[PDB]
Amino acid sequence: HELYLDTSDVVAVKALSRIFPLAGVTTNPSIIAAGKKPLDVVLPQLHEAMGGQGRLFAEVMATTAEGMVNDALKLRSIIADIVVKVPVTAEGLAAIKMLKAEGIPTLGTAVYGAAQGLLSALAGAEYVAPFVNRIDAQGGSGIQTVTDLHQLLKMHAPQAKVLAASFKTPRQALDCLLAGCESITLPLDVAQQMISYPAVDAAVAKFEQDWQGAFGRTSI
Amino acid sequence: HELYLDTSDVVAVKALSRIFPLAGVTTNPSIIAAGKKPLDVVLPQLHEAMGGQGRLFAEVMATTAEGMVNDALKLRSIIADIVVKVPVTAEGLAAIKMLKAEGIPTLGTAVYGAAQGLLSALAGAEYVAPFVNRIDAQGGSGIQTVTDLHQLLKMHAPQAKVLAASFKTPRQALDCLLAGCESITLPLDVAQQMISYPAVDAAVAKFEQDWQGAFGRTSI
Amino acid sequence: HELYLDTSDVVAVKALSRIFPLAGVTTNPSIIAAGKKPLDVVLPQLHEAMGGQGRLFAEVMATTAEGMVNDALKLRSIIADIVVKVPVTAEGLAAIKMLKAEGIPTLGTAVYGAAQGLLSALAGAEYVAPFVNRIDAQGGSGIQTVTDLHQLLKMHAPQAKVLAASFKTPRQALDCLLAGCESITLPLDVAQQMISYPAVDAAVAKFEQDWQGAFGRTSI
Amino acid sequence: HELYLDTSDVVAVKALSRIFPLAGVTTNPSIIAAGKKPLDVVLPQLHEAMGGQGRLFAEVMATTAEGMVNDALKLRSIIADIVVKVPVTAEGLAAIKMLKAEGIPTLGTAVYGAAQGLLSALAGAEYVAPFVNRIDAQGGSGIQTVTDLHQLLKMHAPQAKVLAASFKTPRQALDCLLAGCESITLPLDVAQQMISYPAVDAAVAKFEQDWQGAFGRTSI
Amino acid sequence: HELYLDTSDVVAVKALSRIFPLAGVTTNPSIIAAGKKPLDVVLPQLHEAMGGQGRLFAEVMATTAEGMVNDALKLRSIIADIVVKVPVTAEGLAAIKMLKAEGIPTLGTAVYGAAQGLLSALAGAEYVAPFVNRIDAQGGSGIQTVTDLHQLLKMHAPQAKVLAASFKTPRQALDCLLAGCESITLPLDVAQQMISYPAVDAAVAKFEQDWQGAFGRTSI
Amino acid sequence: HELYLDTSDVVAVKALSRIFPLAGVTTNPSIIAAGKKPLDVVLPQLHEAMGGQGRLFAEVMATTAEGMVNDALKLRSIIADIVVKVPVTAEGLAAIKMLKAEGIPTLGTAVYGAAQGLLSALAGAEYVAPFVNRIDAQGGSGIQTVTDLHQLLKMHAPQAKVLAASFKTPRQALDCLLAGCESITLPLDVAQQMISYPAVDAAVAKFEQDWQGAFGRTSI
Amino acid sequence: HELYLDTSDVVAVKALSRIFPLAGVTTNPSIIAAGKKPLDVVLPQLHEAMGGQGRLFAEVMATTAEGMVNDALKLRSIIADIVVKVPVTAEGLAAIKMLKAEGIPTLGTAVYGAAQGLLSALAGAEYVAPFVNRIDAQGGSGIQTVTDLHQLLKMHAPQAKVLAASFKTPRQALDCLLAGCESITLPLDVAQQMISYPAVDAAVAKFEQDWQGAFGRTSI
Amino acid sequence: HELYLDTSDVVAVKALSRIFPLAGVTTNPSIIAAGKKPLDVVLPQLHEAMGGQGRLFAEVMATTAEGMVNDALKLRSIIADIVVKVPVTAEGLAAIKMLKAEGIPTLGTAVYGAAQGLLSALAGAEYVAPFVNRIDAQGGSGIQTVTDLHQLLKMHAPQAKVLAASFKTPRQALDCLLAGCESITLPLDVAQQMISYPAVDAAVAKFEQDWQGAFGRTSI
Amino acid sequence: HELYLDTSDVVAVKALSRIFPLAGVTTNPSIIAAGKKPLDVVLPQLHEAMGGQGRLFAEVMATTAEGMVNDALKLRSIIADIVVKVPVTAEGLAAIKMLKAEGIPTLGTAVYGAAQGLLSALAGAEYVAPFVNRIDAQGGSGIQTVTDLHQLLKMHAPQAKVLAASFKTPRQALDCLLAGCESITLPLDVAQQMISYPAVDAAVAKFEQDWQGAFGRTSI
């Protein structure tokens, strides 16, 4: 399983890479815009913040397939092994086919439906990113979409993986993991919630208090 | 998975072959009739419109097994590697057996029931095409028929594949894919719906607006 | 159960009112636009085409709540007992509340989610119209949305009914009916498919042939 | 069904009361603290922002049952018919029993488990508020807890209602509604998401474009 | 729903009756033996510890039906309205029939199977007490037994109620409540766990901290 | 619920009538034959052994409807209010109709299928007796047959009851009770197993030992 | 999968062997009796009617194991590779074991229960034939029996196959195929129904009418 | 699958070994006691009655682990390759471990719970024998216990097999087989029921009558 | 499957290692504190009590990752091959990553949620220990958490095993085993309950009584 953070916050990535078993960092245009640093600045900084080991993802902006390929080349000049995110639209699918022919790995993003996601994998995408919370917020079922998508990839495009994205609560992430998703990307707030629990803190405090009671200290 | 378009519209096939990851094009007598061009004109055009890479399918018209075999030979003289569609009737099954003996690949079409479909595969058909929407429109369950048929082929005639056909909505196609169908053929309207979504367009617009807000342009 | 036709085709309404047990006719802005006749011409014609017995529905066009209320008054001046369709948007909900206070019956339309639909009923709508095929075509589950919506109304706003709408195949309509929808509106092609079956025609022909064989005629 | 907003934002309540069919407003200590206005200021402002029709809820702060009863009296002196929220702790349960004897309506809050919630209803609470997202975020299932709690109330304390609370996504609210909850309280962001959908906006725009095409305007 | 404590600890009952919404107290021979006080001392103390409002249950010791009836009379001379617990054995069933004829309310106890429990209700018992944890500890399913028993009573002896007993964890009690049991009796440790949660304490502390931050105190 | 014993053992009936809440005794030709006493001897003895209050059932032996009616009269001359068991065969159904016209209550016996059983109830039988273990032993599912039969009676012949019969293990009886059967008849061995359990005996012994430990006696 | 016809109608077999993909023909004593030709006449005629390529099955008549073995030798002298059908009775099982030792392939027939069928496979039968319709007609579930039998063979005697038999409707055959049966034998009427459908004929007629409309003929 | 008879009846074993495909014979202390012959007489007779090919099982009587090991050695001196049955108690588990170290194969018997059974396999037992009917008779579910036990062995101790035992009806044996049990032992009455069916006899009789009708005899 | 005891009771471990098939012993800070012996005394004693064959586990006490690594080194200096338990907190995850790099095997403990548990396995833990009863006691579902966690490990971190812990009743342990947990640790009371059953003792007593009846002794 590959676990990513969905962020352009370099300081946070450096701090959290020590804690989480990260495969890398994913970005998108809104995340990059929120951080205010251009791609040629922030991508290398994110790469460094993971000690040069993590995989990076970043998204094209052009609206024609040819423009998207040119964007991909720009991204790859910044980070040689970056995975290029392409929105799964008509022109995006055309771009994914072209990038497959060029040997540049892609992720099919802005996926709101399972068939849409599958098309991107059939076209060559290595990863497919459904926007779980967007589907949930807009009256659908993000989890059903993810469940369906994973099944479709495993039956029909088995080289491709779901990279589940767009989360407001740990439960959504848990449900994607239970559906079999082979990768996931978490925003910082959800990631931090997933490792901090009042019940866990209470269990550890009880261990400390019992140890103190018997041995007069809380250290080993 | 093999994805086909169900059409005789040469201009559309050329345009869509750039977008979709197509395995080829399927035709039937109504589709050919609607396009108004004879088989010896349209089939070579369709073959060219896919850059010579796609598989083609076309259907016999005769009502006796012997006549269907003669139709198959005519079709194969137009396109050497064409897959011949035979309606799964008593004479059709007899024809499928004869074509198997001749080494000509066949598809069993006009399938309205799972056992009917299985018989065509046991007789030698490489593909079996249930008419999903026809079953749905006539008070049955196209999806249950497809689900059943796919299970029957995988248990009892595992060399054969379901090629699901006859669709009025993307949901029918999705449900066939979730049932495991190893091939599918889409009419142009359903195919175009499967890659165009208001929610996806809105996600892409939001990315563009956020990028504009931060960087003063919408390009990378 | 209330069965409606979703059309502005006066000739077809006449012909089908004799066959179907219709409660009335629903229109929307696309349906009215397609027919090319203004509301003050077509609505009285549709009312006549059902022999003055059917209920009519038509939709507001304004984008502010106050404008929608004014549109409702215009519609009611054309057909005194017409049910006014209001899209379930923020201003639409505000309009539904105002129309409830005025005693004008409403339908909440353009429903793509169950919670959205429920809000329109809580605001006062007597009917809620999910767009089943639109949800299906855009990667969701129209049938799950209808199932959920009907359950929500029956638990939380039991005076309101689902009026299921937007269909490409009889199976969608059947599934809405099996989910419990107390009303439905069919486009003409789907309505005609629901009463014409090759197997039924074959059963009737067999009855006629057997009768002929025994009695020398096909009449009673 | 009773629909509440979970907020102390008086301007927003006034604006949203025109759109949503609100039963009232719920507050808690964090919400009140975030708004920075004391109870004796903000509660009367909220009451007015709903035109004097909505029900209000506010929470005690004391940690002994006797202190909580005194807090309840203070709250009722600000808003005569306010429902008093009491955290479901040992002293909270004792307070709920005392308030039942005094005839002051209560809500059992900070519910993280179904049995805990049931105990508050058996003690006399009219409403029980599970913290759905808190349970979800801390590795449980908020929806299973709500489902279980509602069943427990309907079997064992049928005068009491679930008032589902603590939401980060509309899907959580939908699932609570489907589980049968007779009341719910939404934060502003989730409430606004529940009434704004790209697919709905696109449907309305298509209606406008079709109308414009036929009639040369977008008004009725 | 009737909630009981399964104890002979008078001091604890007095303390917990202020917190829990108790219907009364159940005792059995082991519970009485553990407390070391005879029945004619402890039963009146328990009755007072609940302020004279709670129902009491206590168990016969004799092994013949006639002896059990005599024990019932002794118990009723200590507490006039006490419910008499009879083990569901052959002689116990005979005793339950006799006590029904005498108008003395009974509970069928030491139930390890659903049919056994039903027989006690058919014989006249008002309550039937499966030993949930005993069934669980001995390789069965206490919850399945309770689920089955409650269904049997509601179908076949609807005047009788399950009084679920014998618990080591709150989850067992929750599952009995979800199965529909109309009464339950909790040992003190499980009852205390059901009202004390680290996550709830943390929620209350966060409320206090937020209030402090804004207003400079933790009181209302 | 009506509980019967399936026996001709008069001594056992008398002993068990004190323990079980019996509605009566059922006999059949094999049971009567096994006991070796003629009907005119054993039926009165069984009636007395229940203190003149139990319902009795006995079976006809004739193979024609007319003969079965005559047998019914012979049975009624021995026990005036006896319920007459008739095997559900073609002649048996004819007899059941005749007996309905005469006002003599009947039970449809030797039922091996649900539809067969339903026919007997539609003909007038007050009770229908599937042979559960016979169906089980002969490769069917006695429990499915009972489940189906009970549903059929409640939907289609609601005045009739299932009287489940033919048991080798308590589990079969439990499963019939859980399926909703309103009456049941148990052979003596199964009945005795249903009230004697090693685990229950161990619970009672533990209560006695704990009481002895604390109070120096095992009596109350 | 192996598909058989269940018939002694030599003319029909010859005609149908051209249409169906047949593995052979099964006979039984009633089928042979109905055809009125002795085994030494009809078996060679059936073998010829399939062009010498189909497998044959025929049934022993003796009631002792030794007699059944002698019958098997007689059958094998008529058709050297015939599969010998043995009814699964006590003596039949003994015969199956003896025939296994002799290397003569057997089928266990007249199977009305799954355990009975499994015993025949454990004894050495290569095929097991449940009588589906007989089980259905006699108040059981033929499909459950087949489903269970197939599972038992695949777990416990995996060299053996279910040869499902005894059908009145195509739906029974479909359900056996869906249960996984690796062979089936169809009576002629059911086989003919499985390849003849009014809806399929209507689809083919529509293709012809559309082709005629466009090209002025119905031939290719 | 290994099929055993649960008996000490030497004459019956000889007769049935010709009919059933037996793997051997199991005995227990009650079975041996019922036959009245000592182990050193009956075990060699049973071994002979199966022609020297069947596996035998017999049970230790000692209550300490050391005594059980001595009993195992005595049993193995009578039948060199006998499988030794050890009750799964604390001392039994200790004995199973010792016998594993000595290389003497064991069966863990008197299993009334799945975890208990699993422990015996983890300790070294090759077979684990749940007492299905005992669990059923005592208010549990023998089939759930067997289902659970088989799952536990296959996951956690895959070298061990369930040997299901203790049966009063063929249905119990069928359900154990459907649960996957790799071995089973049947008492003689259940075994005989499993091969004798009135419906099967009637099928064979009909075949005979039809053959007679056509050919004037009932032989081949 | 690996079975552990959760204890620091050296005498009990020695006694139980003769009965149970133990893989080793787990300790935690409360267990060690309860035993009152320091780690450098008790761990070698536990190791000896299992004859030097069992695996041991013990827990770090430090709150920073660097401190936890130092604690791990101290533990490994006491017992060279000990598995080091680390609480799954932010610093614990950081420690698990460091220990993975150092090649020191770890267990992720104090797990109250499935995602939390998975993170510890992704970070390098060989075992993950959910606190089953703690989750149950605090209003969750310990069994659902274990079920989910095991599925997550098998899909996403297949080198890791669930070591289920924290039990009050054998049923909890059974349900963990049925969920697939590859290891488990039992407190002494639960372990002892799992091998002691009144029904089993009664079965063994019946065997002894039958043997006595036939042979005049209870020994072999």
Ligand SMILES: [Cl-]
């Ligand atoms: Cl994936």
Ligand SMILES: [Cl-]
């Ligand atoms: Cl397929």
Ligand SMILES: [Cl-]
């Ligand atoms: Cl409705």
Ligand SMILES: [Cl-]
């Ligand atoms: Cl509620």
Ligand SMILES: [Cl-]
């Ligand atoms: Cl109850």
Ligand SMILES: [Cl-]
């Ligand atoms: Cl009934």
Ligand SMILES: [Cl-]
């Ligand atoms: Cl098979």
Ligand SMILES: [Cl-]
């Ligand atoms: Cl097994």
Ligand SMILES: [Cl-]
């Ligand atoms: Cl595991």
